[PDB]
RNA sequence: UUCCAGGCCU
């Protein structure tokens, strides 16, 4: 229930934006969780704080 | 100086344990017994609950389940047929023991339900059976469940024969111990070691009761298994000793039923 | 139908337990035709072995002077060509020919291997599978 | 020494304070 | 499943008499296959076990916690302070005969979660039945008896 | 942790001290010295992402500070206490993790993606989502009969309310082939 | 759901003689007894003991599959000796051992004392 | 693409699979549940007339 | 969520021992590890049982009808 | 269903409990696992239809596949991990057990084989009885390396008239291999013959394994004391093999190896160094772990894990990468705020020195992540485009 | 039925 309350949906172009987005960024350190993301589909597009 | 083969040597005793050194037998046997003790020794425990009223927080079956684990007496048992074999349409004092149970939250301060509170209603026929084995300090044993102000719980339990094969509740066992050749002169294992087998792997209390290795000597390839250090515990229902004789017995009977079949089997034919 | 098919005695050139805890492939020379070498693994848990030891290596496919299932004991009385200590039994795969005439046959026992060398195993050593091995001392 | 350094184990107490106030839903709420 | 993406469905259940056992009496409530380790390299699984086998003996809430000063050595030394193998392993006896197990076993508690998704809410079988209207073909979903 | 060299006696250091701490656990005890104070007391800052671009942070507070004196053969192997330009410091690294992850025992010991799975299955397991299910007519939900709090845990769980509302039980697990089932 | 009935582990339902013996033909004088509603508990032990009768050529057993409480026992014997008998013997043999063992455990016990 | 190249069908079943080392390579343990659900039209023949009436 | 009658692993009763434990703590003031050893919980199978249980029941009992 | 053999016809064997309990070897062809995987199954309806499944779709048939003129099924895991152990010269089995083992093989001529050791106590060897499953006319020859008709290390494999003459048995022999005992049997005997073979092999080894036992547990991941320290330097030494080559480039003294930036030509040497190390660092502990080690035993049978695995567990993880370019400076000439600008050193480009046995560091961790996230990323596309391409 | 949404198949 918690994990859901602190979650993030991030829109995309139209079809899987394979590159820039979905990857785990440096600027992500400390803010977003590095391991917790949905397998496949909206992978790396939806984030957990 | 007496007795055929298999021979015990009770190391210690306790109302709840029987550390004994059963020696000179086939490991097969030692285990075959062990097993019997665990799951086939007849017992007695609730197996039917009749919820009339329940305001608890533990929904019916939750409680109904525990009620079955609640160890009940069974010193006799052998004089209380399996409801199934009996002829009474369903059950009777001939096959089962009935208990009651009611609780209300008078103490506006957590009223507790204990196994002690069960109440044998059916004729005990006069025989140690159905008494909520208690090993509690204050004599309450097995906290069934709790309740608040106007919480009420009305039940009706019906304990029958049964054995661990049908469900654990009929387990007089608890947990047996087993070990042999405390040094491994047989090599039944291949100790996993980083460096020193003898270092990393702890030795056993049982090393003493058996001559240590002795490097010199070659390897015994005729080595067999004698002396087995068991420790039959118990839960109550049956005295730690019975959980052993009845084990020695239950098994035994079966081992005979085989002959029984070898006989009945022959008589037949034209 | 039952006779020996080779007798001799050798001396351990060395024993080897490479990565094995109960087996050692060993080898020795002959106390006869110096051309008779020998190779053989051995359950060293049943019959230990040390450098240089005279072990009578006999071989033949038979019982005792006098295919099919394997009776178990009973023979405690029966004929006992076991007048030895070690008595393995397997088969012979290849019959190599180390030039000259110094043929060398390889025999294995359900797992352990063995190889000989020389030439006077002529009319005695058959290409058969059967072949109980033996040792002593 | 009400002003000595601060070993690791300590920080926990700090983080405790955090949530004590904040809350695992801090964001969503505020 | 464990807490290391260690999924798994039961295969069969047994009772003590059949389960393998450690002289102490103790027996597993779960028997996971050794193979699901080397390829996943979920060592932390193993570590959680060694740590819990300790804190379960001393009753000291095992600290897994992200980055910290613990070590297998660190533990294997305490787990050794209780008498059991320093790495966790323990000999066990083949529940059928009682014969030992030439091998030992990494035997210690591990936290496991029962995920919803139980066989029975799935086993679905249809031999003809409910048929759609526009299509006249079987209907979607087991809930509706489709094919 | 704002870590300015505001220390005459020495070098650079946390604008917070063992005192600040006890002063906190003070309130922890009687359930006075807030977090908000730790803020206004210019002791710690809310480092934006952008802003972060212009700072330097010490991982482990202490460790990455004093001088020197053979490391421990059991421990891992961490980089040194380079520079001193440090501006701030990390509360604890374990905080990069989000709920899910934080419940994973020793995540710093698994194949990176493994910790992702656990981040999904915990969201599929059972438990005791709340203690009022008795009065919730939510369409569907399951509660584990006798939930057990885990043995191995994270300092993180403490705040995630776990030992109080677990999602499983510690079962005596035997790793080994047997019947082959 | 599809779970069988617990008791089906020991109650022979609708005619199922415990024993059942079909003559193994693969090899001379040797048979295969099918023990219904039983297991290792009983099996292994009758295997062991049976494996003492010097007049027993072959003896081994096996549980067909965990789901089913049963096991086939195969016994071969020195001709002229009906394996059936060897089972009877190795059988009683167990009881005799047991009996003694029961006795002796009761002996040792009736010579004990402790407070707990 | 979704109705003619691939339809939904009768006489089909699905469940969670769990490996067994006591089966023959080519067998498949079917749960009794499904065994009683899935049928097979069999013609009555003076071959099975017997067995068949039994089943019926 | 109420004590667990008996131990999953081995079975050895544990439904009674509850109240005694909580006491050998708040009162007798002991350390879990021993507390348990005190009440007869030798090997961990039983140990983990108690040491881990979370008596939610209380929190539940604090509601209403 | 992308394989021809992703749908084979099996025999019904109605059983209890709600699961499709299918045999193991036919696991791989369906791409099936048990961690919550389901399977559909249809029922033929006409005498000729079934005929069509039975005569063309039977598993015994699909056994040897044309998409690679080799068998697609074959022994795995427990049976494979076990088959190995069963074999090994160093492994013997006395009577009692052997008698049981014999019995378990459904067929068995019911005629006990001669113990290769009648010597003091009659013994039998894995290889020996394991062959009671192996038919006749079955001939096999291998030769791995030091194989030599009298193969020492049990290299190679030699089976005759259906009896294991020498050499251990594993994935190479029993596997879905090409010259596989399995591939042979099918041909030389029949789809049927071989089909039942998995059965005997399985049931025997499987049963034998039941007792010999087997497992894995941290103790298997800790490499020998010195063999690790010896590594921590095998590491640092490469660092300073970089520190050097680094400044050497911070001086403007390096051949831009035709067609590569000073930058490019630089990193290249760096990377090559780390992995160069990392790997050996691994192997070190590799042939360092005795055979008794479990995690190895499996890797040897070929049932699970490989070099790399043990490497990242017992030795050193490696340099995480995103697009072949080690963790970048998306953080303005640095990897994290935990780094001083313009830091091209490995402790900042994503090189994890620690082993899984020791565990990463907040950095080692986060970089390992970014690297990981990349997997999941394409795994999520390298699957879509795949499926498409397939149809 | 339909329409959108989310989820699960290491
Ligand atoms: Mg799956
Ligand atoms: Zn009655
Ligand atoms: Zn227990």
- The CA distance from E54 to B103, in Å, is 40
The annotation status of B86 as a binding-site residue, yes or no, is: yes
The annotation status of J33 as a binding-site residue, yes or no, is: yes
- The CA distance from J172 to J301, in Å, is 9
- Measured torsion, CA atoms of residues B177, B183, B189, B193, in degrees rounded to the nearest 10: 110
With a CB cutoff of 8 Å and minimum separation 6, the contacts of J210 are E94, E96, F177, F178, F179, F180
Q: Is B152 exposed, middle or buried (0-12, 13-18, 19+ CB in 10 A)?
A: middle
Please indicate whether, in this complex, the C-beta atoms of F145 and B57 are within 8 angstroms of each other: no
Please indicate whether, in this complex, the C-beta atoms of J78 and E33 are within 8 angstroms of each other: yes
Instruction: Flag whether A touches G (3+ CB pairs, 8 A cutoff).
Output: no
How far from chain centre, in Å, is Cα I44?
A: 13
Kindly report the bases of strand K lying within 7 A of a protein C-beta atom: 1-2, 6-10
Domain extent for B127: 43-168
Sign, CA dihedral C69-C73-C77-C83, equals: positive
Statement: the CB of F74 is under 7 Å from strand K: no
- Chain C residue with Cα closest to J91: C22
Mutation pick from I45, I46, I50 vs chain E, by most beta carbons of E within 10 Å, is: I45
- The CA distance from D27 to D25, in Å, is 5
Residue F110 distance to chain H (closest CA, Å): 27
What token pair was written down for J62?
Answer: 């699909």
Q: Is F26 exposed, middle or buried (0-12, 13-18, 19+ CB in 10 A)?
A: exposed
Phi, psi of F8 (to 5 degrees): -60, -55
Residue E61 distance to chain I (closest CA, Å): 9
- Chain E residue with Cα closest to B171: E16
Against chain C, the chains showing at least 3 CB pairs within 8 Å are B, G, J
C-alpha J132 to ligand 3 mean position (Å): 43
Vertex J70 angle, CA J65 and J71, to 5°: 70
Which of J's residues 24-83 have CB atoms within 7 A of nucleic strand K?
A: 33, 35-38
- End-to-end, the C-alpha distance of chain B in Å comes to 52
The closest ligand to the CA of B125 turns out to be: 2
Instruction: Flag whether B touches H (3+ CB pairs, 8 A cutoff).
Output: no
Give the DSSP letter string of J85-113.
HHHSTT-EEEHHHHHHHHHHSSS--S--P
Residues of chain J positioned with their CB less than 8 A from the CB of A23: 322, 370, 373-374, 377
- Number of domains making up chain B: 2
- The CA distance from E69 to A34, in Å, is 22
Find the helix or strand (DSSP H, E) in which F169 lies: strand F169-175
Structural contact between residues C121 and C30, judged by C-beta atoms closer than 8 angstroms: no
- The CA distance from J317 to J352, in Å, is 6
Length of chain C: 137
C-alpha B82 to ligand 2 mean position (Å): 7
Please identify among residues 128-147 of chain F the ones whose CB lies closer than 8 Å to any CB of chain J. Answer: none
Residues B58, B136 within the same domain: yes
Statement: the CB of F121 is under 7 Å from strand K: yes
The closest ligand to the CA of E1 turns out to be: 1
Please indicate whether, in this complex, the C-beta atoms of D24 and A49 are within 8 angstroms of each other: no
Determine if residue J79 is left, alpha or beta; phi over 0 gives left, psi from -120 to 50 gives alpha, anything else beta: alpha
Give the CA A38 to C1' K10 distance in Å: 14
Phi, psi of E66 (to 5 degrees): -25, -110
Please indicate whether, in this complex, the C-beta atoms of F146 and I59 are within 8 angstroms of each other: no
Maximum distance among all Cα pairs of chain A, rounded to whole angstroms: 30
Give the CA J379 to C1' K9 distance in Å: 14
Residues of chain J positioned with their CB less than 8 A from the CB of F59: 338, 361-363
What token pair was written down for B85?
Answer: 């074999």
Structural contact between residues B151 and I62, judged by C-beta atoms closer than 8 angstroms: no
What token pair was written down for J2?
Answer: 């992308």
List strand residue ranges (DSSP E) for chain G, in order: 21-22, 30-36, 56-62, 70-77
Residues of chain A positioned with their CB less than 8 A from the CB of D27: 6, 49
- The CA distance from J81 to J301, in Å, is 5
CA nearest to B240, candidates B181, B177, B179, B180: B177
**What Cα–Cα distance (Å) separates residue F45 from each residue in B79, B241, F56?**
78, 70, 13
Q: Exposed e or buried b for every residue in F88-119, given b needs 16+ CB within 10 A?
A: bbbbbbbbbbbbbbbbbbbbbbbbbbbbbbbb
| Technique used | X-ray
- Number of domains making up chain C: 1
G109 to chain B, any CB pair closer than 8 A? The answer is yes
| Helical packing angle, J77-87 and J294-301, nearest 10° | 100
3-state secondary structure of F25: helix
Which residue among G2, G44, G67 sits closest to E96, beta carbon to beta carbon?
Answer: G44
Maximum distance among all Cα pairs of chain H, rounded to whole angstroms: 45
Instruction: Please compute, for residue F48, the number of CA atoms within 13 A of its CA located in the half-sphere on the CB side.
Output: 3
- The CA distance from B107 to C90, in Å, is 84
* Closest nucleotide to E36 by C1' from CA: K10
Give the DSSP letter string of C31-94.
SSSTT--EEE--BTTTS---SS-EEE-EEESSSS--------S-TTSS-----SS--BB-EE--
* Closest nucleotide to J31 by C1' from CA: K9
C-alpha B171 to ligand 2 mean position (Å): 22
The closest ligand to the CA of I8 turns out to be: 3
Residue G58 distance to chain B (closest CA, Å): 18
- Chain E residue with Cα closest to H19: E11
CA nearest to J8, candidates J71, J56, J48, J43: J56
Determine if residue J143 is left, alpha or beta; phi over 0 gives left, psi from -120 to 50 gives alpha, anything else beta: left
- The CA distance from B263 to A23, in Å, is 77
**What CATH number does residue I25 fall under?**
1.10.10.60
The closest ligand to the CA of I36 turns out to be: 3
**What CATH number does residue C119 fall under?**
2.40.50.140
Against chain G, the chains showing at least 3 CB pairs within 8 Å are B, C, E, H, J
Q: Exposed e or buried b for every residue in J216-234, given b needs 16+ CB within 10 A?
A: bbbbbbbbbeebbeebbeb
Mutation pick from F12, F15, F18, F34 vs chain D, by most beta carbons of D within 10 Å, is: F18
Q: Is H1 exposed, middle or buried (0-12, 13-18, 19+ CB in 10 A)?
A: exposed
Place of tokens 């009896």: J163
Structural contact between residues J299 and J309, judged by C-beta atoms closer than 8 angstroms: yes
With a CB cutoff of 8 Å and minimum separation 6, the contacts of E37 are E45, E46, F175, J216, J295, J304, J305
Expressed in Å, this structure's resolution amounts to 3.7
- The CA distance from E63 to E32, in Å, is 23
**What Cα–Cα distance (Å) separates residue B31 from each residue in B17, B177, B251?**
18, 10, 11
Reduce the secondary structure of A1-38 to three states and give it as a string: CHHHHCEEECCCCCCCCCCCCCCCCCCCCCCCCCCCCC
**What CATH number does residue B135 fall under?**
2.170.120.12
Residues B189, B150 within the same domain: no
D7 to chain A, any CB pair closer than 8 A? The answer is no
Give the DSSP letter string of chain H.
--SSSS---SSEEEEEB--BTTS-TTEEEEEHHHHTTS-------TTTHHHHHHH-
What are the residue boundaries of the structural domains of chain G, listed by start?
1-116
Count CB atoms within 10 A of the CB of residue B8: 25
Please indicate whether, in this complex, the C-beta atoms of H22 and G1 are within 8 angstroms of each other: no
Structural contact between residues C132 and C61, judged by C-beta atoms closer than 8 angstroms: yes
Domain extent for C60: 1-137
The closest ligand to the CA of J27 turns out to be: 1
Statement: the CB of A39 is under 7 Å from strand K: yes
How far from chain centre, in Å, is Cα B252?
A: 17
Q: In terms of DSSP H, where are the helices of J63-190?
A: 77-87, 95-104, 126-130, 181-189
J304 to chain H, any CB pair closer than 8 A? The answer is no
CA nearest to E87, candidates B66, G85, J100, B194: B194
**What CATH number does residue B251 fall under?**
3.30.1360.10
What token pair was written down for B189?
Answer: 């294992």
- CB-proximal residues (5 Å) to ion ligand 1: J 33, 35, 37
What token pair was written down for J21?
Answer: 């309990």
* CATH fourth-level superfamily of G1-116: RNA polymerase, RBP11-like subunit (3.30.1360.10)
- The CA distance from E101 to F174, in Å, is 13
Give the CA F177 to C1' K6 distance in Å: 39
The second-level CATH assignment, the architecture, of J77-212 is Orthogonal Bundle (1.10)
Structural contact between residues J350 and J330, judged by C-beta atoms closer than 8 angstroms: no
3-state secondary structure of J384: helix
Domain extent for I51: 1-65
Residues of chain B positioned with their CB less than 8 A from the CB of F145: 62, 65
Give the CA H20 to C1' K7 distance in Å: 30
With a CB cutoff of 8 Å and minimum separation 6, the contacts of A48 are A3, A6, A7, A8, A32, A33, A36, A37, F98, F99, F100, F119
* Closest nucleotide to A41 by C1' from CA: K7
Structural contact between residues B268 and G17, judged by C-beta atoms closer than 8 angstroms: no
Determine if residue A17 is left, alpha or beta; phi over 0 gives left, psi from -120 to 50 gives alpha, anything else beta: beta
- Chain F residue with Cα closest to E32: F175
Give the CA E141 to C1' K1 distance in Å: 13
What token pair was written down for B31?
Answer: 């285990």
Residues of chain J positioned with their CB less than 8 A from the CB of A35: 369, 372
């Amino acid at each position: 229930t918690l994990s859901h309350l602190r979650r993030t949906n991030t829109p995309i172009g139209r079809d899987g934006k394979l590159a820039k987005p979905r990857q785990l960024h440096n600027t992500h350190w400390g803010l977003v969780c590095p391991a917790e993301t949905p397998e496949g589909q909206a992978c790396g597009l939806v984030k957990n704080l | 100086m007496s007795e055929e083969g298999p021979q015990v040597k009770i190391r210690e005793a306790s109302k709840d344990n029987v550390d004994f050194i059963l020696s000179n037998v086939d490991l097969a046997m030692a285990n075959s017994l062990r097993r019997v003790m665990i799951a086939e020794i007849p017992t007695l425990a609730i197996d039917s609950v009749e919820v009339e009223t329940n305001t608890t927080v533990l929904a019916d079956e939750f409680i109904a389940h525990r009620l079955g684990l609640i160890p009940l007496q069974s010193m006799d048992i052998e004089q209380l047929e399996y409801s199934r074999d009996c002829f009474c349409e369903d059950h009777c004092d001939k096959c089962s023991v009935v208990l009651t149970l009611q609780a209300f939250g008078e103490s506006e301060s957590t009223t507790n339900v204990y196994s002690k509170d069960l109440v044998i209603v059916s004729n005990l026929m006069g025989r140690n059976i159905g008494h909520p084995i208690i090993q509690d300090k204050e004599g309450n044993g097995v906290l069934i469940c709790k309740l608040r102000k106007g919480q009420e719980l009305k039940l009706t339990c019906v304990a029958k024969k049964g054995i661990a094969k049908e469900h654990a509740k009929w387990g007089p066992a608890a947990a047996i111990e087993f070990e042999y050749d405390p040094w491994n002169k047989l090599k039944h294992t291949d100790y996993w070691y980083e460096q020193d087998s003898a270092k990393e792997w702890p030795q056993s209390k049982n090393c003493e009761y058996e001559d240590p290795p002795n490097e010199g000597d070659p390897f015994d390839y005729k080595a067999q298994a004698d002396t087995f250090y068991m420790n039959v515990e118990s839960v109550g229902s049956i005295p730690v000793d019975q959980v052993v004789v009845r084990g020695i017995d239950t098994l035994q009977k079966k081992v005979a039923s085989i002959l029984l079949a070898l006989t009945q089997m022959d008589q037949d034919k034209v | 139908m039952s006779n020996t098919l080779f007798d001799d005695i050798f001396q351990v050139s060395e024993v080897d337990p490479g990565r094995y805890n109960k087996v050692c492939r060993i080898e020795a020379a002959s106390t006869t035709q110096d051309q008779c070498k020998l190779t053989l693994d051995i359950n060293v848990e049943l019959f230990p072995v040390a450098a240089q030891d005279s072990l009578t290596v006999t071989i033949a496919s038979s019982l005792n002077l006098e295919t099919r299932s394997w009776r178990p004991p009973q023979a405690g009385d029966r004929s006992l060509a076991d007048d030895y200590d070690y008595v393995m039994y397997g088969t012979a795969y290849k019959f190599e020919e180390v030039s000259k005439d110094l043929i060398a046959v390889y025999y294995s026992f359900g797992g352990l291997l063995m190889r000989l060398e020389g030439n006077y195993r002529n009319l005695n050593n058959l290409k058969q599978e059967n072949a109980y091995l033996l040792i002593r001392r | 020494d009400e002003s000595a350094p601060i070993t690791a184990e300590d920080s926990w107490a700090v983080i405790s304070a955090f949530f004590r106030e904040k809350g695992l839903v801090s964001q969503q709420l505020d | 499943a464990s807490r290391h993406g260690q999924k798994g469905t039961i295969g069969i259940t047994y009772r003590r008499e059949d389960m393998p056992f450690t002289a102490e009496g103790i027996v597993p409530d779960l028997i996971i296959n050794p193979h699901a380790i080397p390829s996943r390299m979920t060592v932390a699984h193993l570590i959680e076990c060694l740590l819990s086998k300790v804190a379960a003996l001393s009753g000291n809430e095992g600290d897994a916690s992200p980055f910290t000063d613990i070590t297998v050595e660190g533990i294997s030394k305490l787990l050794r302070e209780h008498g059991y193998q320093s790495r966790g392993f323990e000999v066990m006896y083949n529940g059928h005969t009682g014969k030992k197990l030439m091998a030992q076993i990494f035997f210690g508690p591990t936290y496991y979660q029962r995920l919803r998704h139980m066989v029975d809410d799935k086993i679905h079988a249809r031999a003809r039945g409910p048929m759609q209207v526009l299509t006249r073909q079987p209907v979607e979903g087991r809930s509706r008896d489709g094919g | 942790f704002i870590v300015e060299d505001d220390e005459s006696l020495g070098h650079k250091e946390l604008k917070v001290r063992k005192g600040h701490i006890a002063k906190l656990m003070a309130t922890e005890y009687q359930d006075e010295y807030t977090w908000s104070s730790l803020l206004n007391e210019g002791l710690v800052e809310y480092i934006d992402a952008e802003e972060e671009e212009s700072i330097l942070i010490a991982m482990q507070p202490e460790d990455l500070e004093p001088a020197e004196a053979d490391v421990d053969p059991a421990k891992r192997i961490r980089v040194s206490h380079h520079a001193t330009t440090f501006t701030h410091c990390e509360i604890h690294p374990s905080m990069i993790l989000g709920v899910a992850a934080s419940i994973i025992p020793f995540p710093d010991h698994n194949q990176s993606p493994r910790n992702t799975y656990q981040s999904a299955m915990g969201k599929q397991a059972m438990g005791v989502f709340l203690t009022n299910y008795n009065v919730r007519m939510d369409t569907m939900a399951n509660i584990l009969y006798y939930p057990q709090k885990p043995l191995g845990t994270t300092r993180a769980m403490e705040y995630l309310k776990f030992r109080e509302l677990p999602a499983g039980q510690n079962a005596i697990v035997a790793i080994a082939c047997y019947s082959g089932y | 759901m599809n779970a069988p009935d617990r008791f089906e582990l020991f109650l022979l339902g609708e005619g199922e003689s415990k024993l059942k013996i079909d003559p193994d033909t693969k090899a001379p004088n040797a048979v295969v007894i099918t023990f219904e509603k039983e297991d290792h508990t009983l099996g292994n032990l009758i295997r062991a003991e049976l494996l003492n009768d010097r007049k027993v050529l072959f003896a081994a057993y096996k549980v067909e599959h965990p789901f089913f409480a049963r096991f086939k026992l195969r016994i071969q014997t020195t001709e002229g000796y009906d394996p059936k008998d060897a089972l009877k013997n190795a059988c009683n043999s167990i009881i005799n051992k047991l009996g003694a063992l029961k006795t002796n455990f009761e002996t040792e016990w009736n010579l004990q004392t402790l407070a707990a | 693409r979704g109705n003619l190249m691939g339809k939904r069908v009768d006489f089909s079943a699905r469940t969670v699979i769990s490996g067994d080392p006591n089966l023959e390579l080519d067998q498949v343990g079917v749960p009794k549940s499904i065994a009683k659900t899935l049928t097979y039209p069999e013609v009555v023949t003076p071959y099975n007339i017997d067995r068949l009436t039994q089943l019926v | 969520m109420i004590v667990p009658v008996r131990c999953f692993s081995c079975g050895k009763v544990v439904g009674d021992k509850w109240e005694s434990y909580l006491n050998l703590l708040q009162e007798d003031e002991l350390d879990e590890g021993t507390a348990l050893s005190r009440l007869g919980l030798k090997r961990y199978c039983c140990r983990r049982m108690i040491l881990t249980h979370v008596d939610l029941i209380e929190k539940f009992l604090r509601y209403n009808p | 269903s992308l394989h021809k053999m992703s749908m084979m016809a099996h025999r019904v064997k109605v059983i209890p409990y709600s699961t499709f309990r299918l045999n193991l070897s036919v696991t791989s062809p369906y791409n099936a696992d048990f961690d919550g995987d389901e399977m559909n199954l249809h029922v033929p309806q006409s005498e000729e239809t079934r005929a069509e499944l039975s005569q063309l779709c039977a598993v015994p048939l699909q056994i040897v596949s044309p998409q690679s003129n080799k068998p697609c099924m074959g022994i795995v895991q427990d049976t494979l991990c076990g088959i190995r152990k069963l074999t090994l010269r160093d492994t013997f089995i006395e009577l009692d057990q052997v008698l049981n083992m014999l019995y378990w093989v459904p067929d068995w001529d019911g005629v006990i084989p001669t113990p290769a050791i009648i010597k003091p106590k009659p013994l039998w060897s894995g290889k020996q009885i394991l062959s009671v499953a192996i038919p006749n006319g079955i001939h096999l020859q291998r030769f791995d390396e030091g194989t030599t008709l009298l193969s020492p290390k049990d290299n190679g494999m030699l089976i005759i008239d259906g009896q294991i003459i020498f050499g251990v048995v594993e994935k190479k022999t029993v596997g879905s291999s090409n010259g596989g005992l399995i591939h042979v049997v099918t041909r030389e005997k029949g789809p049927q013959v071989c089909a039942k073979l998995f059965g005997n092999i399985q049931k025997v080894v499987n049963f034998w394994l039941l007792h010999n036992g087997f497992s894995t547990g941290i103790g298997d991941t800790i490499a020998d004391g010195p063999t690790m320290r010896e590594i921590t330097e095998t590491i640092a030494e490469a660092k300073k093999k970089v520190l050097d080559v680094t400044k050497e480039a911070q001086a403007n003294l390096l051949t831009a190896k035709h067609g590569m930036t000073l930058r490019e030509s630089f990193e290249d040497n760096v990377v090559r160094f780390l992995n160069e190390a990392r790997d050996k660092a691994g192997r070190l502990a590799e042939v360092n772990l005795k055979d008794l080690n479990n995690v190895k035993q499996m890797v040897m049978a070929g049932s699970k894990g490989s070099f790399i695995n043990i490497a990242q567990m017992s030795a050193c993880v490696g340099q995480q990468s995103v697009e072949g370019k080690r963790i970048a400076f998306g953080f303005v000439d640095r990897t994290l705020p935990h780094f001083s600008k313009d830091d091209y050193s490995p402790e900042s480009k994503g090189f994890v020195e620690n082993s899984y046995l020791r565990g990463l560091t907040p950095q080692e961790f986060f970089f390992h992540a970014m690297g990981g996230r990349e997997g999941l990323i394409d795994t999520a596309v390298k699957t879509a485009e795949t499926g498409y391409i397939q149809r």
